[PDB]
Amino acid sequence: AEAGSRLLAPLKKPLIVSGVLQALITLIELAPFVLLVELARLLLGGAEAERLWTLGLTAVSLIGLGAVLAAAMTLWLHRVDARFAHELRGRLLTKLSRLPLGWFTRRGSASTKQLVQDDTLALHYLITHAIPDAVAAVVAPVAVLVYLFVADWRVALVLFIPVLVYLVLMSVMTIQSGSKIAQAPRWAERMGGEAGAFLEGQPVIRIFGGAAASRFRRRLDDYIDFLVSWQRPFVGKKTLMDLVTRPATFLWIILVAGVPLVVTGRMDPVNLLPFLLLGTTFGARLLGIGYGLSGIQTGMLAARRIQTVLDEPELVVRDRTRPGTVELDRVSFEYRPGVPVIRDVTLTLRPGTVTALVGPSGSGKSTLAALVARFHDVTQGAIRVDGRDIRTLTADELYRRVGFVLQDAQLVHGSVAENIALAEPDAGLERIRTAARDAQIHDRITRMPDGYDSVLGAGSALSGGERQRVTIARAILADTPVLVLDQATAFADPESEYLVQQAINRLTRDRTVLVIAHRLHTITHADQIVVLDDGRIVEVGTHDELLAAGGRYRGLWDSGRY
Amino acid sequence: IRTLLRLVPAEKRGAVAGYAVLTLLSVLLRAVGAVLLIPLLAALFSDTPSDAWLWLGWLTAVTLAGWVTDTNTARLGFDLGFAVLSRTQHDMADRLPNVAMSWFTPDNTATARQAIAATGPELAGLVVNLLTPLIGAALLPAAIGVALLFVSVPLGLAALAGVAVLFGALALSGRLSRAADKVAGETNSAFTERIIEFARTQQALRAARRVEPARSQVGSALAAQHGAGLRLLTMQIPGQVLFSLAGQVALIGFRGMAVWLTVRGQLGVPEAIALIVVLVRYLEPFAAIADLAPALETTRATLNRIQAVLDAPTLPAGRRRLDRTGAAPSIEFDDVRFSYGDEVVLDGVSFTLRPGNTTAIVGPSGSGKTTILSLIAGLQQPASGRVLLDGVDVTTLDPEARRAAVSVVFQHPYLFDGTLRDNVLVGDPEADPDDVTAAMRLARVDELLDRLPDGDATVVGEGGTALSGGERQRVSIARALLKPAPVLLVDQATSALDNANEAAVVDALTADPRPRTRVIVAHRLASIRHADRVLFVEAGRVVEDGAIDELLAAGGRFAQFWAQ
Ligand SMILES: Nc1ncnc2c1ncn2[C@@H]1O[C@H](COP(=O)(O)OP(=O)(O)OP(=O)(O)O)[C@@H](O)[C@H]1O
Ligand SMILES: Nc1ncnc2c1ncn2[C@@H]1O[C@H](COP(=O)(O)OP(=O)(O)OP(=O)(O)O)[C@@H](O)[C@H]1O
Ligand SMILES: [Mg+2]
Ligand SMILES: [Mg+2]
C-alpha cells in the first residue's frame, strides 16, 4: 500500500533491526534444545557426571542469554513503537485543527475517536510484533526442519504433515476473514456513533420511542450479528490451528512414525532424540504468525486509513499576504458541491458600526459568520480583515482579530472559570469575574456549590439561557476588535437580554459588531440592517428605511407582532 | 470471576455446566496423554520395543479424544462468550433509558460509553481467549505434577512446587502493574472523553485558539496518556520476563532433576529420557498464561464498567395505567418540590391545569420552567410532593404508559444522525404517511423540503449539526406533533425561528387537530398568543397566574416582564 507504507516509513531501520535480532534470538533459543539432545544422547551412553553437567550449564546460560536478548528487544521495540503512536497522535491532532469543519460534521465525534485513538492503537501489532513473529516463524521451523531432515528424513516428512495442514488453515482463515476485517472499522464507527447519540440524546430516547424502539437497540443487534458471523469461523479455525501446532500433536505424529521405525529394524532409538526435543519446540512459533496475519491486516488498513486523513486538504495559510474592518467581496460558499448556500454576498463591516444580519431561518446568516471565522474557505470571492485576506492570515492573527458567539453554548468539560477563560486560559480570576458580570452570570455562578471552579460537563450543566451567557462572557473576555454574535440572547428572557445587550453596547462602542438576530425589536438601533434571504442580500438599510421600502423586512416586522 | 458467571443468561447456564465438564475432561485427557508417554518411551528404548505398540494405542485414543473435546470446548466457549456479550449489552441498552438522569455525570457517561464501546470481538472471546487457557493451565500442570508422584516423589513434589512459584510469580506481576494499569486506564479513558469534546466542540475551540496540541485540552490528555502508557510498559514487561524466564528455569530445573536422579540411580535411563521429553508438557500450559496479564486486566476492567451500568439507580416507577387514555388529562402539582443536588429548584409549587386547554409558562432565565416540563414528562421526579396526570401520580404510572402520555419539544433540539424523515418518524414510527406530512406541514418543515436538495432525505449530522438552528428546531417540532400523546410540552420551540416561521408554528402548536393539554414555555410574547392561562415563575415559585389580558391590565410582574 502506497499510503500504508508511506506512514510507517520512519520505522524502517528499527523494524529491520527487529527482524535481524529475532533471527539471532531464535537461534539462541533453539541452541539449548540441541544441547539437551546431546545431554540426552549422553545419558544413553552413560558418560561421567561432570560431562553431563557442563552441557547442562551451557544450556542454562543460553536459556538466560536468549531470555535477556528476547526481553531486550521487546522492551526496546515497545518503547520505539509507543513513541511512534504519540508522534502519530500528535500529528493527527495537529492535522484536525487545520481541516475545514465540513470534515468534522460529515464524520462526527465517533469517527474522530476511531481515528486518533483506535486506529493508532490498531498499528501496535503491525510494528511491535509483526516482524519478530514473521522472522521467528520462518527462522525456527526452517532451522529445526533442516536439522531434523539431516537426522532422519522419514520422520522429518511425517513432522512436515502438520506444517502443511497449518498453512492451509492459516491461508483459508486469512482470506475468509479478509473481507470482514475490512468492514470491521466501519461497524465500530457506526456503533460508536449510536453509543454517542444514545447517551447524548437521552431525553429524546426516553420520551420518543423509549428503550425498545431506539435505533441503538436495532443497530446493536445488527452489530452482534456481524461479530458472530465474523468471529465464528475465525475462532473455529484458530482452535484447529492451535491443535495442529500443539506440542502434543507433533509428539504424537513423531511417535506414529517413530514407533514403527524403532520397533522394526529401520531406525535406532538414538535418532528419535532430535525429534522428541526439537520437533515440538517450533509449534508455538508457527502459531505466532497464524494469530498475527489478522493483526497485520487491521494494522495495514489502519495505517492506510490514518494516512488518508493526513493527506486531506487543509486550511492552508497562503504566502501572498481600516483596523477592525471586515470586507466580503463577492463571497460565495457551498457546503456541498452544487448546493449554493451563499451567493455573491458583498458586505463591508466597519469599526464603530453595529451591522444587523436578519432574514428567514436557513438563509445563510450563520454560515456567513462561519466563513468570516474561516471554518470553511469561500468558494469564490474573498474575505479581508483589515485589508489582509483571511486565507493569508494565520490562525492566531485571524482569531485574535475576530471573536465569535456561535449560536450553540459549546461548553468544554472544565470549570466555570475555564469555560469563560477558554480564549486566554491564563486570564486572571478577577478578569474572569468582570467578564461574567458583563454577561449577567456572575450572580448565578456565585450560588453554585464550588463557585467558579464548578465543573460544567454532562450531568452538571446549566440552564439553556445560562450556558449561552457563559459563551457571551467568553467573547467579552477575549475582547477582539471584531465581534460576530450569532443569535446571542436567543434563550434569554427580556430582562437579561436587555442587560447583556447594554453591556455589549458599552463594550463594543469603538469596535466592529455583526449581530445576528430573529428578534427584530432589538435590531431597530443597528446602523445597517442587512436582510439575507436564500443566501443573497436582498435589501440593506436602516430600520425606518426598510419599513418604508416595505419588503421582506417589513413582512418579518409585521409578522413579528402577530 | 464471580461477577462473570452471574452475567450469563439463565437459559445458557446449561451450557456453562457442560463447558466445565469438557474443561475438566480436556485437562484430564491431556494429563493422561502425558502420562502414557512415560511407559511408551521407556518401553521404546528398552530391549523389547514391541511393547510400545500398546501404549501408542492409548496415546492416539486419548489424543483424538483431546481434539474432540477441545473443538467442542471452543464452541461452548464461543457461545458462552457471545451469550454474555449479547445479554449484557442488551441489558445495558434497556437499563440506561430507565436510569436516573442524575446518574449521567461526566465520569459515569464515560464508563457507560466505554461499557457500550466494549461490544467488539475483544470482549466477545472473554471465555475462549482468557478463561479456557487460564483454567486449562491451572489444573493441567498440577495434574502432571501429581502424576509424577508415581514415577519419582522428589520430581513430582518439585513439579507441584513449580506450579506454586509460577502462579506466585504471576501474582507478583499482577500486583506490581495493578497500580500502573489503573492510571493507564484512567488517562486512556480521559483521552477518549477529550477527543469526543475536541471533535464535538471544534467551533468553540478554534475561535478560542485552543486547538493546537501545545495548548489544547486534548493535547494535555494525550501527553498524560503517553506518560501513563510508557509507565505501564516499564512496570509490565519486567513482570513478563520474570514469569517467562522462571518458566524456563523451572523446566530446565526438572530436566536437571531427572538427569540427577539417573546419576544417583533412583531412576532408569529410559524413564529419565522419557521424563525429559514429557516435562515440556509442564511448561506448555504455563506458556499461554504469560501474555494474558494485559488481557486479564482489560477484561476485568470492562466487566467492572458493565456491572457499574447494571448497578445504576433505575428511576422509580409503578404499574398504574393512565385513566384518561384517550382524552386530555388534567395536569397538576401537589406541593411539588425538586432540587438538583443541593440547590433548590422548586419549593411549594402547586397548580392545577384543566384538561384540553393551553397554558403558558413565562419567567426569568434560571427560574426553573424547563424543570416543570421535565417533571410532567417524567424525566425528573420530585423530592417531595407528586405530579398527577388526571389524578394519577406519575411515579406510580407504568413507564410504558408514562412516556405515551407526554410529548416534549426540548429547548436544545437534538436530532440523530440520519435522514430528516427518520427524526420526524421517531415520534410515532407507526404513523401513516399522511400523518407524517400533516405534522411536517404543520411545523413548517415543508419549507425545508422545498429548499434542501434531497428533501426529506438530507443526512443530518450528529445532533442537528448539518442543519441550521431553526431547521433542527422545526424538525423537533414536527417530531413532537407527530406523537399522538394527549399532553404537549413546548419548551421554547420558537427561539431560532424568524417572525415568519414563529408565527406559523405558534398557530400550528395551538391549533393542531386532536385535543391535548398544552403547556408552553417561551421568552417571546408572540409565542404565547391567545393562551388560556399563564404561569409566571421567578424564584422557582409561581408568582402569579391568570389570563394574558388580565395580567396586562393588572400591571404585575408579567407587565414589567415585556416592558424592556
Ligand atoms: N443538570 C443540571 N444539574 C444541575 N443544575 C441544573 C441542571 N439543569 C439545570 N440546573 C439548574 O436548574 C435551575 C433551573 O434550570 P432550568 O433548566 O429549569 O431553567 P429554565 O428556567 O428553563 O431556564 P432557561 O430560561 O435558561 O431555559 C438553574 O439554576 C440551572 O442552573
Ligand atoms: N454542515 C452542513 N452541511 C450541509 N448543509 C449545511 C450545513 N450546515 C448548514 N447547512 C445548510 O446551510 C443552510 C443555511 O444554514 P445556516 O446555519 O447558515 O442557517 P441560518 O440562516 O443561520 O439559520 P437560523 O436562523 O435558523 O439559525 C441551511 O439550508 C442548512 O441546511
Ligand atoms: Mg443560524
Ligand atoms: Mg429552560
Side-chain angles (χ1 to χ4, degrees), chain A residues 1-561, chain B:
Chain A
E2 187 66 15
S5 62
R6 180 153 51 92
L7 181 63
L8 304 169
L11 306 179
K12 187 177 174 182
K13 281 175 183 180
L15 287 172
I16 294 285
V17 169
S18 291
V20 172
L21 294 175
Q22 184 76 327
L24 303 174
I25 288 158
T26 51
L27 293 174
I28 289 165
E29 287 175 1
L30 293 168
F33 303 127
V34 173
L35 296 172
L36 277 161
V37 169
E38 193 67 22
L39 174 56
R41 187 170 294 178
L42 255 58
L43 278 169
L44 293 174
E48 55 262 29
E50 190 64 18
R51 190 179 182 186
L52 278 81
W53 267 86
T54 54
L55 288 171
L57 292 173
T58 181
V60 168
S61 64
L62 287 164
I63 287 169
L65 184 62
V68 167
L69 272 46
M73 193 184 66
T74 56
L75 175 54
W76 160 71
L77 193 52
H78 282 207
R79 287 179 59 267
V80 164
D81 294 353
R83 291 187 300 92
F84 177 70
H86 183 210
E87 181 178 349
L88 178 54
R89 279 162 181 162
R91 287 164 58 186
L92 285 162
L93 298 169
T94 301
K95 185 67 178 199
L96 295 189
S97 61
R98 283 150 172 74
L99 300 167
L101 299 190
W103 184 96
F104 289 80
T105 58
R106 70 183 60 176
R107 298 188 65 166
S109 60
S111 179
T112 298
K113 191 269 184 200
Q114 190 72 1
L115 185 69
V116 179
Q117 198 169 354
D118 287 8
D119 288 336
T120 62
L121 183 136
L123 299 174
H124 181 83
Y125 191 90
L126 177 55
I127 57 185
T128 44
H129 303 277
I131 294 284
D133 291 12
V135 173
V138 64
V139 168
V142 175
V144 168
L145 286 165
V146 169
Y147 186 92
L148 300 175
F149 192 93
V150 170
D152 199 315
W153 63 266
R154 292 160 291 191
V155 185
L157 292 169
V158 170
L159 214 170
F160 191 72
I161 290 164
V163 169
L164 295 172
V165 174
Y166 169 78
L167 294 171
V168 169
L169 269 49
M170 189 172 73
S171 73
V172 301
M173 191 186 72
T174 301
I175 67 188
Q176 282 197 353
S177 188
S179 59
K180 297 287 187 176
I181 290 161
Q183 305 169 32
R186 171 164 181 78
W187 274 101
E189 291 179 7
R190 293 203 296 187
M191 172 47 54
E194 298 298 342
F198 184 84
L199 297 166
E200 177 55 24
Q202 270 294 343
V204 182
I205 289 281
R206 288 170 146 74
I207 291 158
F208 302 105
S214 57
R215 198 199 308 166
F216 173 55
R217 293 281 288 98
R218 282 136 54 82
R219 202 190 297 271
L220 178 61
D221 302 1
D222 302 327
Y223 187 19
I224 291 160
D225 289 10
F226 169 72
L227 297 170
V228 171
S229 301
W230 171 29
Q231 297 292 324
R232 174 172 297 284
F234 183 69
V235 169
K237 262 69 176 183
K238 270 177 68 174
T239 59
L240 294 175
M241 290 199 314
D242 201 327
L243 296 170
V244 169
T245 62
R246 207 161 52 183
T249 298
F250 293 122
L251 182 53
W252 171 69
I253 293 160
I254 290 157
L255 295 163
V256 168
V259 172
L261 296 172
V262 172
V263 171
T264 317
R266 314 199 75 171
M267 178 174 179
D268 193 299
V270 299
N271 291 339
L272 267 177
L273 291 168
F275 293 86
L276 299 173
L277 290 152
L278 290 161
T280 74
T281 52
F282 69 94
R285 298 175 192 278
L286 284 173
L287 195 72
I289 51 168
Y291 293 5
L293 285 167
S294 60
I296 288 161
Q297 286 174 334
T298 61
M300 290 291 290
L301 295 167
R304 181 193 60 74
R305 174 161 59 265
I306 291 157
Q307 185 60 43
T308 295
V309 179
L310 297 166
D311 298 356
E312 289 276 321
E314 302 182 354
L315 297 176
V316 302
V317 172
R318 308 189 307 183
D319 196 11
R320 177 57 177 79
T321 304
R322 195 178 296 185
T325 297
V326 177
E327 310 168 16
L328 284 74
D329 173 68
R330 302 199 70 191
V331 176
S332 304
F333 176 57
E334 319 178 354
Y335 277 96
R336 297 179 292 181
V339 183
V341 186
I342 298 296
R343 305 186 191 83
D344 197 351
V345 164
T346 302
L347 175 57
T348 301
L349 306 172
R350 293 180 173 80
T353 62
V354 179
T355 298
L357 184 62
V358 295
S361 70
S363 45
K365 62 196 81 65
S366 291
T367 181
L368 284 181
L371 292 171
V372 170
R374 204 196 171 186
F375 304 140
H376 324 261
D377 277 321
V378 299
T379 297
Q380 306 179 9
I383 310 184
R384 314 196 186 84
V385 180
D386 308 5
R388 285 276 294 285
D389 198 321
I390 55 168
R391 290 187 262 195
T392 63
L393 287 175
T394 189
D396 305 329
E397 293 175 331
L398 166 55
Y399 296 119
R400 287 176 67 269
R401 246 159 283 279
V402 201
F404 292 88
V405 181
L406 302 159
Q407 199 184 13
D408 300 334
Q410 290 164 317
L411 303 177
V412 294
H413 176 51
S415 48
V416 184
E418 186 60 20
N419 293 282
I420 292 162
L422 194 76
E424 188 167 6
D426 62 307
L429 187 63
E430 176 53 29
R431 221 167 71 87
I432 290 164
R433 287 200 298 273
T434 55
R437 291 169 184 175
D438 290 319
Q440 308 298 322
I441 199 161
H442 161 85
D443 297 76
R444 164 55 191 164
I445 295 160
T446 52
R447 296 189 299 92
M448 269 188 278
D450 203 353
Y452 284 80
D453 304 4
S454 297
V455 174
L456 299 182
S460 183
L462 303 129
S463 57
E466 288 171 10
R467 57 183 299 193
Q468 198 174 62
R469 276 184 277 182
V470 169
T471 70
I472 293 165
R474 182 192 299 171
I476 292 165
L477 198 80
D479 193 1
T480 60
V482 185
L483 186 62
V484 174
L485 299 174
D486 192 356
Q487 295 185 47
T489 77
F491 298 117
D493 59 314
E495 213 83 356
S496 302
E497 172 169 300
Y498 172 80
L499 289 171
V500 302
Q501 183 182 322
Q502 290 282 311
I504 287 167
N505 291 338
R506 194 186 92 268
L507 290 164
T508 61
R509 296 179 290 92
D510 301 8
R511 278 181 165 79
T512 299
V513 174
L514 176 64
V515 68
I516 315 190
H518 292 296
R519 302 181 187 183
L520 276 57
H521 58 89
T522 61
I523 290 287
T524 56
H525 299 291
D527 290 313
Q528 49 172 336
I529 293 79
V530 175
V531 178
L532 187 75
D533 188 4
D534 289 315
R536 84 195 72 261
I537 291 165
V538 288
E539 56 191 355
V540 185
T542 57
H543 171 61
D544 303 324
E545 288 182 11
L546 285 168
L547 292 183
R552 182 73 82 248
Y553 184 81
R554 179 61 160 177
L556 292 173
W557 187 262
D558 289 1
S559 178
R561 305 301 87 86
Chain B
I1 196 174
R2 294 175 180 78
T3 186
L4 199 166
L5 299 174
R6 59 176 60 188
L7 299 171
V8 306
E11 183 271 357
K12 208 78 184 179
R13 193 261 163 185
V16 176
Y19 165 79
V21 172
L22 297 180
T23 296
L24 286 175
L25 179 61
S26 180
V27 171
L28 185 136
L29 291 177
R30 290 162 66 188
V32 168
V35 166
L36 293 172
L37 283 159
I38 290 157
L40 168 51
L41 290 166
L44 199 63
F45 298 108
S46 298
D47 301 359
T48 53
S50 305
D51 304 331
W53 282 115
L54 171 52
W55 301 104
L56 177 58
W58 295 122
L59 186 64
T60 299
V62 167
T63 295
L64 294 176
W67 293 353
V68 171
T69 306
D70 287 320
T71 55
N72 282 274
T73 307
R75 291 171 185 170
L76 301 180
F78 181 85
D79 293 3
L80 289 171
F82 268 101
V84 172
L85 187 70
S86 64
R87 190 78 281 179
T88 50
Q89 296 295 338
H90 290 180
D91 288 4
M92 287 195 301
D94 303 8
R95 176 53 165 274
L96 288 163
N98 300 278
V99 166
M101 286 294 295
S102 61
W103 179 79
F104 290 94
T105 59
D107 185 12
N108 289 329
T109 306
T111 65
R113 176 148 38 70
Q114 283 183 288
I116 294 165
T119 310
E122 76 295 349
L123 181 58
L126 74 100
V127 170
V128 180
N129 300 332
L130 183 60
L131 296 181
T132 291
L134 181 60
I135 293 164
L139 305 175
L140 180 51
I144 293 162
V146 67
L148 290 172
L149 292 172
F150 310 109
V151 192
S152 178
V153 169
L155 179 56
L157 293 171
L160 290 167
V163 178
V165 303
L166 283 163
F167 268 96
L170 191 70
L172 293 174
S173 67
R175 274 282 294 172
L176 261 69
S177 66
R178 178 160 183 177
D181 208 328
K182 177 174 177 179
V183 182
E186 291 181 352
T187 57
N188 184 18
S189 170
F191 183 47
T192 298
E193 299 172 31
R194 295 291 184 176
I195 291 162
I196 295 284
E197 159 173 316
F198 176 76
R200 182 176 292 170
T201 68
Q202 191 65 232
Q203 281 182 356
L205 299 172
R206 283 195 183 194
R209 305 183 305 287
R210 202 82 185 277
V211 287
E212 56 265 25
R215 190 165 51 169
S216 61
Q217 284 175 307
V218 70
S220 302
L222 173 54
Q225 189 258 32
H226 182 57
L230 287 177
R231 196 177 298 167
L232 179 56
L233 300 171
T234 298
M235 297 176 69
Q236 174 168 115
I237 291 162
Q240 296 187 238
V241 67
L242 267 282
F243 181 84
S244 180
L245 178 56
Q248 296 174 332
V249 166
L251 179 58
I252 197 72
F254 304 150
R255 288 178 162 173
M257 287 187 177
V259 170
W260 171 67
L261 291 172
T262 316
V263 173
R264 196 155 74 171
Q266 302 181 248
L267 186 64
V269 169
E271 285 73 352
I273 291 165
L275 286 162
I276 292 160
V277 169
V278 169
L279 280 160
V280 72
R281 304 294 221 83
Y282 184 90
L283 192 66
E284 146 178 337
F286 269 105
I289 282 164
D291 63 313
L292 298 177
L296 176 53
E297 173 50 31
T298 54
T299 295
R300 174 165 65 183
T302 56
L303 294 171
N304 283 28
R305 285 189 285 267
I306 289 167
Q307 184 61 31
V309 174
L310 305 176
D311 294 4
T314 291
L315 202 63
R319 307 192 194 287
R320 292 273 277 98
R321 304 291 294 189
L322 186 65
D323 303 337
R324 271 191 158 84
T325 314
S330 65
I331 297 160
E332 58 188 337
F333 283 15
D334 183 16
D335 298 359
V336 172
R337 298 187 174 76
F338 186 74
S339 304
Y340 287 105
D342 297 315
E343 280 70 47
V344 67
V345 178
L346 311 182
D347 189 358
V349 180
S350 177
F351 58 90
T352 303
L353 308 182
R354 287 173 295 285
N357 291 120
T358 297
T359 295
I361 294 161
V362 305
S365 197
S367 162
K369 49 181 178 293
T370 297
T371 297
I372 291 162
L373 312 181
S374 303
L375 295 161
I376 293 163
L379 303 173
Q380 304 296 336
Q381 298 196 347
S384 76
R386 63 190 193 286
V387 182
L388 308 177
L389 296 173
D390 191 63
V392 175
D393 196 338
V394 301
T395 300
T396 67
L397 280 174
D398 181 14
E400 187 176 4
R402 192 157 61 191
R403 60 169 57 83
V406 176
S407 76
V408 188
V409 175
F410 305 98
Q411 202 185 138
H412 307 105
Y414 187 88
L415 308 182
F416 304 94
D417 196 342
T419 57
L420 200 165
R421 190 185 180 82
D422 279 16
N423 302 285
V424 176
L425 280 174
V426 308
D428 189 3
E430 322 307 338
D432 187 289
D434 290 8
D435 294 321
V436 176
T437 62
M440 289 199 304
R441 183 174 52 73
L442 279 173
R444 298 277 282 195
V445 179
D446 59 353
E447 188 185 337
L448 327 189
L449 314 184
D450 307 336
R451 169 166 63 265
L452 299 165
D454 309 65
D456 63 323
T458 50
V459 172
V460 179
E462 192 178 31
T465 51
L467 292 174
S468 61
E471 276 167 322
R472 70 175 81 99
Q473 185 155 112
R474 276 178 287 169
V475 174
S476 178
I477 294 156
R479 177 175 62 191
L481 263 58
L482 188 64
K483 191 175 178 185
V487 181
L488 181 62
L489 309 178
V490 198
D491 193 355
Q492 307 205 75
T494 63
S495 298
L497 304 177
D498 56 324
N499 292 347
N501 291 320
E502 166 166 309
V505 166
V506 167
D507 299 1
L509 289 159
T510 67
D512 70 330
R514 57 167 67 268
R516 304 176 190 245
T517 296
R518 302 185 193 81
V519 189
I520 294 160
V521 171
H523 288 124
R524 303 179 69 177
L525 183 62
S527 297
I528 58 177
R529 198 180 77 268
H530 66 79
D532 181 66
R533 187 180 170 191
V534 189
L535 301 174
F536 191 94
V537 276
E538 182 168 6
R541 187 178 64 81
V542 173
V543 173
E544 61 188 36
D545 50 3
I548 293 163
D549 300 68
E550 185 176 353
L551 292 165
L552 293 167
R557 293 188 181 175
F558 183 86
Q560 302 182 10
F561 187 55
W562 314 97
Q564 288 186 339

